[PDB]
Amino acid sequence: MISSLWIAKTGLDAQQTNMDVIANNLANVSTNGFKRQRAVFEDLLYQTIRQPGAQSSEQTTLPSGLQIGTGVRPVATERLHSQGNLSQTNNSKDVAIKGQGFFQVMLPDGTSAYTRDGSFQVDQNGQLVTAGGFQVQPAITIPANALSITIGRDGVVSVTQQGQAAPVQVGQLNLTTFMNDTGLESIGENLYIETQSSGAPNESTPGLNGAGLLYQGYVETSNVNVAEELVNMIQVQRAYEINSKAVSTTDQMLQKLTQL
Amino acid sequence: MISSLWIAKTGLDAQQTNMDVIANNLANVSTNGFKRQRAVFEDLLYQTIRQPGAQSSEQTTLPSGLQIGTGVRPVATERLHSQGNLSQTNNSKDVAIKGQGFFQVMLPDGTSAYTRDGSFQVDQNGQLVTAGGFQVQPAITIPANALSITIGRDGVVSVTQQGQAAPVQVGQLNLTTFMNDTGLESIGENLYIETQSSGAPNESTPGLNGAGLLYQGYVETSNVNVAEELVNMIQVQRAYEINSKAVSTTDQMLQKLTQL
Amino acid sequence: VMLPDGTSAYTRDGSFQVDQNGQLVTAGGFQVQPAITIPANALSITIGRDGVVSVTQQGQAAPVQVGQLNLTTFMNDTGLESIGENLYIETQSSGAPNESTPGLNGAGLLYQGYVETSNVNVAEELVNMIQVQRAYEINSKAVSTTDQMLQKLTQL
Amino acid sequence: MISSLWIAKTGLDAQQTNMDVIANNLANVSTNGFKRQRAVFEDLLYQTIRQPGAQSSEQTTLPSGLQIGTGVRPVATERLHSQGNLSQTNNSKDVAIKGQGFFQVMLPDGTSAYTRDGSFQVDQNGQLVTAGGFQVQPAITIPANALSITIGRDGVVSVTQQGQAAPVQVGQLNLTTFMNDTGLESIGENLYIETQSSGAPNESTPGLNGAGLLYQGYVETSNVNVAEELVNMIQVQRAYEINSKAVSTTDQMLQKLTQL
Amino acid sequence: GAQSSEQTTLPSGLQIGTGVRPVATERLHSQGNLSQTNNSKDVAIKGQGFFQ
Amino acid sequence: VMLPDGTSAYTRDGSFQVDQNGQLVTAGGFQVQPAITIPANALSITIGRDGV
Amino acid sequence: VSVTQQGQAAPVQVGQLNLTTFMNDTGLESIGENLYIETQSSGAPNESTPGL
Amino acid sequence: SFSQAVSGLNAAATNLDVIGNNIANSATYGFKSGTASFADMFAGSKVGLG
Amino acid sequence: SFSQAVSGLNAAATNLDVIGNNIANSATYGFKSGTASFADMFAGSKVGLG
Amino acid sequence: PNTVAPVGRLKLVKAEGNEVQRSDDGLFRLTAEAQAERGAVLAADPSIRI
């Protein structure tokens, strides 16, 4: 009923979204290959009671007219694709990517998704799949009687057979890149898909066209700085309480007005 | 039908619009590059029952005639164009301008707006755009397979390639200065448009002719002081209560009059 | 919007729903004149800043366009006749409507997710009602005095 | 007997209905798969005293004739068919649907309802019924001596028997989607019945045609945002108070007319 | 979906809830943690079943 | 409205009730001329904006 | 009186609302619709720009 | 906001339970250490779910 | 007042990270120790930015 | 509503009052001098407003 009330309501909603993204960042602080989120707001329209720069007289102009804001809206919520710290697990079936790029994954329906976390396992049939039953698009198949699996900086993969003391190659792990990494549509189970906002994916061997290298035995931790989350949470709480105080003041004014 | 009633109406309206601008300032306390507003009021005309300085006799003159007020009106609103605090995001695509200036933006219609919020993204076509799709007017086109992006203190922007072991320039972020910054008309999405009382825009390189420098990785915070906003809220609440009391007194007086 | 009897009305209240045929209609069943239709199994309906409507699907990697929300402008907004169902119809007082895309020829823009409130100032209504109550009482007193003086006249 | 009384009565009734829906939302904030409701209003007819645009002279016309309102009337209520949060229960028979769709439930009289609340229990005959005794329409029959129940993302349900070293399929879960989710009529057991506004149902397996997936061990909570409900309650109380003030003013002027 | 006119039907009607009630309190027959007591006549079962 | 003596009268007051036979009648027993009947076991009756 | 256009920054002047004054405002003959017409008691009207 | 925090708390509790189980089964002969892997979950975009 | 304190806290965290990197990189044959360098920033005069 | 169309115009006369005589049924008519000096039937004048 009062413009002040609606403006304060929009402010409360914005602070709520900020707190929600903070909680989301803190919840999966230990998720491998997770990128933290950041929300960006913008002001809403402005009601122009007196147009700025108006022709007040034959030669005089208003230096600045009368304009009233009407609130704030969250314009976007974007990922921050930084490079997470590399851990040391000393496992043969987890690969960390240094630089840019994503592993391609064949979804059950038939489309293609992209992931950043490399921690692979083997299905019952010998295919190399990510945790969740999604196989890699180039279809790397590990044969039986495999002594060890070796992956170099490039995508080439090799398996040490029981005999002949000579490693053989059974595939290659290329990386896909995008023009706009922040435009990827994130979905559940730690996956991304392509949209119009991002560019057309381009395949590349590791170490070429700016694509990152591969390291075996390492995993990539989330780039969530737990130190900044606490101070951001304090600021969010303070701003939320201040907006609540504004709502309370407006309600007090209305209640006093209705007592006539 | 009483002058006091119409005067108290104007007083209530002035307090309401003051509270509205306070709530607007408190709403987008987290919006990047937001300049707070304050309202300036003026009194209305005066009814001269007896003319001041009129000849009261052959030699005497009235020291001061009988003049009656009419009320108040908000005459303007101005934005304090000071320098906001710079926060760090460690993002290579965030630019914060220290000093005075605005980035020029090409609206889809064909007109050009000017903004202070430096927080840029790259679309699918590899062009620097703002959060909302509006492109930067100098038309910076970042090529693909870009290892890193560097923006100096001045407007030059370079991109590191895989080869050639040297940065390559791809544009320059000239910014515009105005004779009168307050005269820019404010629209949504943190945008301002030129008006008559703002003067022709002046393109300039950063660091010259009073133009500010550019910092990469930082983002400018809004200049809002909540400590003053709280006391402003208390003051406007009390003023609204006083004006409501005046209205109630006039109503009681008129009601007792009409019982004859 | 189009009334069932063929004629077209105009409204400011943007609160739309989808019927069984996948047509964007107002809350009340009246369908929008440019005839925006939504395909089945839509995932996310987005509306552009200048009226372009797009919809996502299951496997498609790009949004598909489905319509445009061109809106009309009038020479004199106050002259439109207001029918009950939160709708306006053009009259001879207002000029002939001219339809245009948002953002051009002085037309507005569209925001998705928000709805426009009402521009009613509460603080003015209360003082206005106090004023009208007092004026009503004063006129009643005038009637009473006239009646009393007429009675005194006719008594003799 | 005065138009103002009739108008204010409609205003009070509309505010009462709004408060009623707010309280209904506030009541079952702990109901699984519950959708909040929003009431939309629309004014009543108008009385035209002077026809707008009618000639006032040979060449002039009335810019806008006299036109009096009649009040307000609620027209519809919409359910925000968004996605609620997911909470973990570690109960093997709790299934949460992520996305769009409903489980079909066979009512005792033979009709079919649709529910989104996934909390299933097995009765004495092995039927997979919902909490209330109604059985799921595809007729999933859990055999005895079942060590565990597995429900995949594609909604295929299998059991782990004593041996055989391999689970056996016992049925499938099919999800029905409607053209207009907001059009379904609710009957009050987390059940919605198909009506004319919503399209004819069409079964589809999860993960196809935009239908959502299934997560075992999770339940979807209601999408009720109390932070908005509190502000709505404040606004409703103020509006009700103002309308009561209007009624009191009309009564006072009627009394003064009576005393005439 | 009422037939509000000859052709137009209301996409969503006017319905008001009447509250909420508890329908059941289900037990969670999961497996508890086993402890050690070193007593001759203290028996714990793993899996499913009940002593009579 | 059909009067008892055959003639028809016109009324603007809308207050209708269902008779024992189901026919829609006005408050007073006089029945509406177009002869609208309501079947029993009816969940809810709706009337359109154009008199359907 | 000025009106701002779509693209143009500078407002475009469209007219001037000059107003009239009389030697004796009391002598104007009043009719309906808040209108006054000149008489012999009131002098001939003179038009001027506001403020002068 | 509350449900995401609850989910994170449960995930941390699960991780600590795994750590405790690994450290308790030390000195066991035919034993292999266990580790936990987590995964984010989103409804559409910009809507985190823990 | 928040921005200056947050900036100082971030600088201290950077210094600690550099120290930890140096201490953890001992016994690396081809290694050179790293030291951080800081600089205050002022907008005009009498205004602190961190 | 945009189909309003004029369908006629009334005829208003302006009689001073010293030259009109009442008939025997309540209507007024021009007297002999009035009809002699202003014709048999008066002419509508645009100055009359209703």
PDB file of C-alpha atoms in Angstrom, chain D residues 34-170:
ATOM      1  CA  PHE D  34       2.884 -28.417  -0.801  1.00  0.00           C
ATOM      2  CA  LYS D  35       2.554 -25.400  -3.088  1.00  0.00           C
ATOM      3  CA  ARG D  36       1.827 -21.890  -1.860  1.00  0.00           C
ATOM      4  CA  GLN D  37      -1.142 -19.941  -3.197  1.00  0.00           C
ATOM      5  CA  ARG D  38      -1.412 -16.318  -4.300  1.00  0.00           C
ATOM      6  CA  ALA D  39      -4.745 -14.529  -4.698  1.00  0.00           C
ATOM      7  CA  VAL D  40      -5.208 -12.056  -7.563  1.00  0.00           C
ATOM      8  CA  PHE D  41      -7.847  -9.322  -7.414  1.00  0.00           C
ATOM      9  CA  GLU D  42      -9.883  -7.485 -10.027  1.00  0.00           C
ATOM     10  CA  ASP D  43     -12.277  -4.576  -9.629  1.00  0.00           C
ATOM     11  CA  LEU D  44     -16.020  -4.789 -10.230  1.00  0.00           C
ATOM     12  CA  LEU D  45     -18.139  -2.970 -12.818  1.00  0.00           C
ATOM     13  CA  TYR D  46     -18.497   0.791 -13.236  1.00  0.00           C
ATOM     14  CA  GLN D  47     -21.370   3.265 -13.336  1.00  0.00           C
ATOM     15  CA  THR D  48     -21.073   5.728 -16.221  1.00  0.00           C
ATOM     16  CA  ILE D  49     -22.809   9.047 -15.578  1.00  0.00           C
ATOM     17  CA  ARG D  50     -21.424  10.961 -18.577  1.00  0.00           C
ATOM     18  CA  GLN D  51     -20.288   8.967 -21.596  1.00  0.00           C
ATOM     19  CA  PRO D  52     -16.617   9.627 -22.444  1.00  0.00           C
ATOM     20  CA  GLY D  53     -15.985  11.025 -25.893  1.00  0.00           C
ATOM     21  CA  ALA D  54     -19.529  12.335 -26.291  1.00  0.00           C
ATOM     22  CA  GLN D  55     -19.859  15.674 -28.055  1.00  0.00           C
ATOM     23  CA  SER D  56     -19.822  18.762 -25.837  1.00  0.00           C
ATOM     24  CA  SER D  57     -20.262  21.124 -28.811  1.00  0.00           C
ATOM     25  CA  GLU D  58     -20.204  21.006 -32.603  1.00  0.00           C
ATOM     26  CA  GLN D  59     -16.448  20.345 -32.503  1.00  0.00           C
ATOM     27  CA  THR D  60     -15.371  19.628 -28.899  1.00  0.00           C
ATOM     28  CA  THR D  61     -15.636  16.350 -26.990  1.00  0.00           C
ATOM     29  CA  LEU D  62     -15.417  15.386 -23.339  1.00  0.00           C
ATOM     30  CA  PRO D  63     -11.871  14.113 -22.676  1.00  0.00           C
ATOM     31  CA  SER D  64     -13.135  11.771 -19.948  1.00  0.00           C
ATOM     32  CA  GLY D  65     -16.664  11.327 -18.639  1.00  0.00           C
ATOM     33  CA  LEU D  66     -17.810  10.680 -15.097  1.00  0.00           C
ATOM     34  CA  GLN D  67     -17.260   7.046 -14.111  1.00  0.00           C
ATOM     35  CA  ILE D  68     -17.698   5.675 -10.584  1.00  0.00           C
ATOM     36  CA  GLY D  69     -16.323   2.365  -9.359  1.00  0.00           C
ATOM     37  CA  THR D  70     -18.130  -0.328  -7.410  1.00  0.00           C
ATOM     38  CA  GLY D  71     -15.475  -2.180  -5.404  1.00  0.00           C
ATOM     39  CA  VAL D  72     -13.176  -5.175  -5.741  1.00  0.00           C
ATOM     40  CA  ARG D  73     -13.637  -8.932  -6.102  1.00  0.00           C
ATOM     41  CA  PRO D  74     -11.072 -11.758  -5.926  1.00  0.00           C
ATOM     42  CA  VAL D  75     -10.965 -13.577  -9.254  1.00  0.00           C
ATOM     43  CA  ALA D  76      -8.445 -16.417  -8.954  1.00  0.00           C
ATOM     44  CA  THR D  77      -5.722 -18.070  -6.898  1.00  0.00           C
ATOM     45  CA  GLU D  78      -2.548 -19.477  -8.426  1.00  0.00           C
ATOM     46  CA  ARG D  79      -0.313 -22.203  -7.024  1.00  0.00           C
ATOM     47  CA  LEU D  80       3.398 -21.452  -7.385  1.00  0.00           C
ATOM     48  CA  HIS D  81       4.332 -24.774  -9.000  1.00  0.00           C
ATOM     49  CA  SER D  82       8.026 -24.212  -8.375  1.00  0.00           C
ATOM     50  CA  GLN D  83      10.609 -26.693  -7.078  1.00  0.00           C
ATOM     51  CA  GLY D  84      10.791 -27.053  -3.322  1.00  0.00           C
ATOM     52  CA  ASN D  85      13.856 -27.967  -1.334  1.00  0.00           C
ATOM     53  CA  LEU D  86      14.850 -31.594  -0.805  1.00  0.00           C
ATOM     54  CA  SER D  87      15.336 -33.070   2.664  1.00  0.00           C
ATOM     55  CA  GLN D  88      17.001 -36.396   3.420  1.00  0.00           C
ATOM     56  CA  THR D  89      15.201 -39.050   5.463  1.00  0.00           C
ATOM     57  CA  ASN D  90      17.371 -42.168   4.894  1.00  0.00           C
ATOM     58  CA  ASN D  91      14.130 -44.145   4.488  1.00  0.00           C
ATOM     59  CA  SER D  92      14.270 -46.489   1.508  1.00  0.00           C
ATOM     60  CA  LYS D  93      10.584 -45.937   0.669  1.00  0.00           C
ATOM     61  CA  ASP D  94      10.730 -42.125   0.371  1.00  0.00           C
ATOM     62  CA  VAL D  95      10.997 -40.919  -3.231  1.00  0.00           C
ATOM     63  CA  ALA D  96      11.300 -37.276  -4.284  1.00  0.00           C
ATOM     64  CA  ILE D  97      10.499 -36.218  -7.845  1.00  0.00           C
ATOM     65  CA  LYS D  98      12.884 -33.558  -9.174  1.00  0.00           C
ATOM     66  CA  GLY D  99      11.403 -31.514 -11.997  1.00  0.00           C
ATOM     67  CA  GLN D 100       7.860 -31.940 -13.318  1.00  0.00           C
ATOM     68  CA  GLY D 101       5.221 -34.637 -13.039  1.00  0.00           C
ATOM     69  CA  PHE D 102       3.062 -36.524 -10.554  1.00  0.00           C
ATOM     70  CA  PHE D 103       2.504 -40.017  -9.214  1.00  0.00           C
ATOM     71  CA  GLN D 104      -0.881 -41.432 -10.182  1.00  0.00           C
ATOM     72  CA  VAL D 105      -3.015 -42.780  -7.336  1.00  0.00           C
ATOM     73  CA  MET D 106      -6.071 -45.012  -7.752  1.00  0.00           C
ATOM     74  CA  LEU D 107      -8.879 -43.749  -5.526  1.00  0.00           C
ATOM     75  CA  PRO D 108     -11.214 -46.279  -3.871  1.00  0.00           C
ATOM     76  CA  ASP D 109     -14.184 -45.342  -6.061  1.00  0.00           C
ATOM     77  CA  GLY D 110     -12.111 -46.079  -9.182  1.00  0.00           C
ATOM     78  CA  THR D 111     -11.036 -42.573 -10.198  1.00  0.00           C
ATOM     79  CA  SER D 112      -7.440 -41.334 -10.354  1.00  0.00           C
ATOM     80  CA  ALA D 113      -5.729 -38.538  -8.442  1.00  0.00           C
ATOM     81  CA  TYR D 114      -2.199 -37.185  -8.782  1.00  0.00           C
ATOM     82  CA  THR D 115       0.223 -36.496  -5.951  1.00  0.00           C
ATOM     83  CA  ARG D 116       3.719 -35.091  -5.626  1.00  0.00           C
ATOM     84  CA  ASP D 117       4.258 -36.153  -1.999  1.00  0.00           C
ATOM     85  CA  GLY D 118       6.508 -39.185  -2.158  1.00  0.00           C
ATOM     86  CA  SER D 119       6.198 -41.158   1.066  1.00  0.00           C
ATOM     87  CA  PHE D 120       5.231 -44.754   0.343  1.00  0.00           C
ATOM     88  CA  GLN D 121       4.483 -47.672   2.639  1.00  0.00           C
ATOM     89  CA  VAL D 122       3.855 -51.351   1.953  1.00  0.00           C
ATOM     90  CA  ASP D 123       0.618 -52.804   3.301  1.00  0.00           C
ATOM     91  CA  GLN D 124      -0.078 -56.433   4.188  1.00  0.00           C
ATOM     92  CA  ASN D 125      -0.629 -57.525   0.569  1.00  0.00           C
ATOM     93  CA  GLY D 126       2.678 -56.131  -0.689  1.00  0.00           C
ATOM     94  CA  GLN D 127       1.058 -53.192  -2.477  1.00  0.00           C
ATOM     95  CA  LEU D 128       3.092 -49.983  -2.531  1.00  0.00           C
ATOM     96  CA  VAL D 129       0.428 -47.666  -1.145  1.00  0.00           C
ATOM     97  CA  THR D 130       0.670 -44.037  -0.107  1.00  0.00           C
ATOM     98  CA  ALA D 131       0.137 -42.792   3.443  1.00  0.00           C
ATOM     99  CA  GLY D 132      -3.635 -43.114   3.605  1.00  0.00           C
ATOM    100  CA  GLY D 133      -4.217 -46.508   2.026  1.00  0.00           C
ATOM    101  CA  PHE D 134      -4.533 -45.528  -1.632  1.00  0.00           C
ATOM    102  CA  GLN D 135      -2.336 -47.637  -3.891  1.00  0.00           C
ATOM    103  CA  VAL D 136      -0.135 -46.352  -6.698  1.00  0.00           C
ATOM    104  CA  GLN D 137      -1.785 -47.024 -10.037  1.00  0.00           C
ATOM    105  CA  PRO D 138       0.953 -49.010 -11.895  1.00  0.00           C
ATOM    106  CA  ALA D 139       0.447 -51.620  -9.116  1.00  0.00           C
ATOM    107  CA  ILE D 140       3.928 -52.223  -7.729  1.00  0.00           C
ATOM    108  CA  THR D 141       3.911 -55.426  -5.660  1.00  0.00           C
ATOM    109  CA  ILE D 142       6.834 -55.872  -3.267  1.00  0.00           C
ATOM    110  CA  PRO D 143       7.441 -59.584  -2.591  1.00  0.00           C
ATOM    111  CA  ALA D 144       8.244 -60.809   0.895  1.00  0.00           C
ATOM    112  CA  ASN D 145      11.766 -61.442   2.244  1.00  0.00           C
ATOM    113  CA  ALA D 146      13.015 -58.351   0.380  1.00  0.00           C
ATOM    114  CA  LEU D 147      16.351 -57.229   1.804  1.00  0.00           C
ATOM    115  CA  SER D 148      16.215 -53.816   0.123  1.00  0.00           C
ATOM    116  CA  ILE D 149      14.319 -51.796  -2.484  1.00  0.00           C
ATOM    117  CA  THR D 150      16.209 -49.885  -5.180  1.00  0.00           C
ATOM    118  CA  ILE D 151      14.571 -47.187  -7.312  1.00  0.00           C
ATOM    119  CA  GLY D 152      16.703 -45.812 -10.114  1.00  0.00           C
ATOM    120  CA  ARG D 153      16.725 -42.362 -11.650  1.00  0.00           C
ATOM    121  CA  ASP D 154      14.618 -43.716 -14.531  1.00  0.00           C
ATOM    122  CA  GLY D 155      11.987 -44.968 -12.090  1.00  0.00           C
ATOM    123  CA  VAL D 156      12.597 -48.717 -12.353  1.00  0.00           C
ATOM    124  CA  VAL D 157      12.070 -50.467  -9.021  1.00  0.00           C
ATOM    125  CA  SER D 158      13.887 -53.684  -8.121  1.00  0.00           C
ATOM    126  CA  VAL D 159      14.327 -55.737  -4.961  1.00  0.00           C
ATOM    127  CA  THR D 160      17.298 -57.554  -3.436  1.00  0.00           C
ATOM    128  CA  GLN D 161      16.259 -61.094  -2.516  1.00  0.00           C
ATOM    129  CA  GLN D 162      18.202 -63.586  -0.395  1.00  0.00           C
ATOM    130  CA  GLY D 163      20.364 -64.915  -3.237  1.00  0.00           C
ATOM    131  CA  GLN D 164      20.604 -64.860  -7.038  1.00  0.00           C
ATOM    132  CA  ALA D 165      23.384 -62.244  -6.675  1.00  0.00           C
ATOM    133  CA  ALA D 166      21.265 -59.901  -8.823  1.00  0.00           C
ATOM    134  CA  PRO D 167      18.206 -57.747  -8.081  1.00  0.00           C
ATOM    135  CA  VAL D 168      14.967 -58.502  -9.916  1.00  0.00           C
ATOM    136  CA  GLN D 169      12.625 -55.866 -11.324  1.00  0.00           C
ATOM    137  CA  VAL D 170       9.212 -55.697  -9.643  1.00  0.00           C
TER     138      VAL D 170
END
